[PDB]
Write a structure and sequence with these properties.
Structural class of chain A: little secondary structure
Shape of chain A: rod-shaped
Keywords: collagen, triple-helix, twinned crystal, structural protein
Entry title: Structure of (PPG)4-OOG-(PPG)4_H monoclinic, twinned crystal
Oligomer: homotrimer
Number of strands of chain A: 0
Chains A, B, C: collagen-like peptide
Assembly: trimeric
PDB class: structural protein
Largest interface: A-B, 25 and 25 residues
Helix content of chain A: under 10%
Chain lengths: 26, 25, 24
């Protein structure tokens, strides 16, 4: 009979960076 | 015969912080 | 015998925003 499934894969790549922060103060 | 492929792994970590914002008025 | 490992997961979520900008 066919063997078990393989192990799960590794983690994916990091997500992209976040958007710019808010403008600074006056 | 071998088994089928395992399930996909977990998502990657969160990305790094974004660039600083523009200067204020 | 076991199958091959699965593929890598999807990208993680976007990071947080950067810090506020400097004073004007």
């Amino acid at each position: 009979p066919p063997g078990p499934p393989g192990p799960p894969g590794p983690p994916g790549p990091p997500g992209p960076p976040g958007p710019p922060g808010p403008p600074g103060p006056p």
